[PDB]
Design a protein around this ligand. Structure first.
Ligand SMILES: CC(C)(Nc1ccccc1)C(=O)N1CCC(CNC(=O)CCl)CC1
Ligand SMILES: CC(C)(Nc1ccccc1)C(=O)N1CCC(CNC(=O)CCl)CC1
Ligand SMILES: [Mg+2]
Ligand SMILES: [Mg+2]
Ligand SMILES: [Mg+2]
Ligand SMILES: [Mg+2]
Ligand SMILES: [Mg+2]
Ligand SMILES: [Mg+2]
Lengths: 236, 5, 236, 5
């Protein structure tokens, strides 16, 4: 890898600079380099990894949606035939997105998840695994689509099982996992009732535990609780 | 689009 | 070039799709491919080329400024020594920016400018040449800094001379050239009085010619006139 | 930053 000659600490330093400069492709490359040094990541370092790739893949997903919408209108009744270009360029963006997802899943499999023994790190990485299989599922159409969906489900479920046993209901990782697994149910698994039930139960159980928290923990937890509520409002 | 983190 | 096997019309089609998807790096690569087919560009095609690279280099310039500010604070009295990383990463972004500028200048030199005989196309390309030498000047520190600045000045001046002879004072290309050459004076050439004089004279001469215009031309011209006024307000 | 086009 092109980052093999840079110090781990220098990679982390430059990832933070890239974030400040909104250079998220660079940030992701720096953090990939840091993961490949082979040491476990701290909480702050896990957050840098997540932020970098979330921004990269988020932009790809937005672009894919623009192009997929144009392509679908191109195939409506009365649309003028315009050649292969829209499909080709949608496929180009799609292939780049799949490549990023495969890269992230590769980092989790080699070897972040297997070395993660603490509940907070293990749940964080398994949530990420669910998330990046979910992004692969958003664009999947072939023989392995159901298996891609189940790979997302299985990662999220393992993360949920650990988080329920080992973390309080207000823990931001537990909350963000539940938020995203709820979206998985609604948008990927065609299970809106499960999505709504999960979001509501997560919100209510967190509400009942807020009284245990400091002001700073309360701010962290209620931020994600508001995202649960926002989704419930969209869906009901 | 629903919220995810 | 990787676009050598794609049809010119397909490259232009995909540049427009990339714009809609806000994929400006792709848009620039498609338009570079189209230029390298060797045919002259239409007005719409020139605009696609300009938009693509303006967005790419604009993001690089913003990032370079963030990193340069961090670097300059790193060298103030009482700042903790933090190693070579800030300089290195600023240099990385700088080198990528210079590469984009060199690519654009290369397209203009081989062979867009020499084939551009109509005033509108020739002035458009010479403005671009001034602009991309100006971006090189923003980051230049070496033996050839003065020559880079003069290369920008010389391109802008030739464009100005043609535009004054061949285009009305409300022509949007003439106006945008004057706007940018005024910024060149203020920010690069350390000539704020020249910058102010040019912006004001350009604005007043355009104002006096608005009466000749249709509603649609009036909207185009007054948009850029407002940018002149905005700069004059910043500078006075 | 001043305006340019
Ligand atoms: C910023 C935000 C909303 N994103 C988030 C990402 C994933 C799950 C939940 C939330 C957030 O709340 N956090 C960022 C990540 C750290 C991870 N900390 C450890 O693994 C220890 C916790 C807090
Ligand atoms: C969008 C805007 C503000 N950007 C601009 C760019 C360069 C110079 C002046 C303005 C604009 O006004 N235009 C875009 C470019 C076309 C170029 N048209 C021909 O070369 C024929 C004219 C109009
Ligand atoms: Mg070392
Ligand atoms: Mg495909
Ligand atoms: Mg349940
Ligand atoms: Mg051909
Ligand atoms: Mg340099
Ligand atoms: Mg004069």
């Amino acid at each position: 890898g092109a980052m093999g000659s840079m110090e781990r600490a220098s990679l982390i330093q430059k990832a933070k600079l890239a974030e400040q400069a909104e250079r998220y492709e660079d940030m992701a490359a720096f953090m990939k380099g840091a993961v490949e040094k082979g040491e476990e990541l701290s909480c702050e370092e896990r957050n840098l990894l997540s932020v970098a790739y979330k921004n990269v893949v988020g932009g790809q997903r937005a672009a894919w949606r623009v192009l997929s919408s144009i392509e679908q209108k191109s195939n409506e009744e009365g649309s003028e035939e315009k050649g292969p270009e829209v499909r080709e360029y949608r496929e180009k963006v799609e292939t780049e997105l799949q490549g990023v997802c495969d890269t992230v899943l590769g980092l989790l499999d080699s070897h972040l998840i297997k070395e993660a023994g603490d509940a907070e790190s293990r749940v964080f990485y398994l949530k990420m695994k669910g998330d990046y299989y979910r992004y692969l599922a958003e664009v999947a159409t072939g023989d392995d689509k159901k298996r891609i969906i189940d790979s997302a489900r299985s990662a999220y479920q393992e993360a949920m099982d650990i988080s329920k046993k080992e973390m309080p209901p207000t823990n931001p990782i537990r909350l963000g996992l539940a938020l995203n697994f709820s979206v998985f149910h609604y948008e990927i698994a065609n299970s809106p009732e499960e999505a709504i039930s999960l979001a509501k139960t997560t919100f209510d159980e967190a509400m009942a535990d807020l009284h245990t928290l400091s002001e700073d923990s309360y701010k962290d937890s209620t931020l994600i609780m508001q995202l649960l509520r926002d989704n419930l409002t969209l869906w009901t | 689009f629903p919220a995810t983190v």
